[PDB]
Amino acid sequence: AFLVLDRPEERITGINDPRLRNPSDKFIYATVKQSSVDIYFRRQVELST
């Protein structure tokens, strides 16, 4: 039982993941300044946080 479920969890399901939809300092998001990704997030309504 200990060996079966000592499995770490990694980020999946893209930006739809609610486990880290709310920002916190433990994990860091990043992109490249002045790119298409910056325009996409800046022009999105729900993706403002």
Add this chain to the structure above:
Amino acid sequence: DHLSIVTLEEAPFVIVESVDPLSGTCMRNTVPCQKRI
């Protein structure tokens, strides 16, 4: 018509934010509101 509505800052219901420094007035998905002191 035109009418005035009271509101109060709440956690997920009414989040009051400062004025937008990029657009200038307010961002998308937001509505201007006033306050007196």
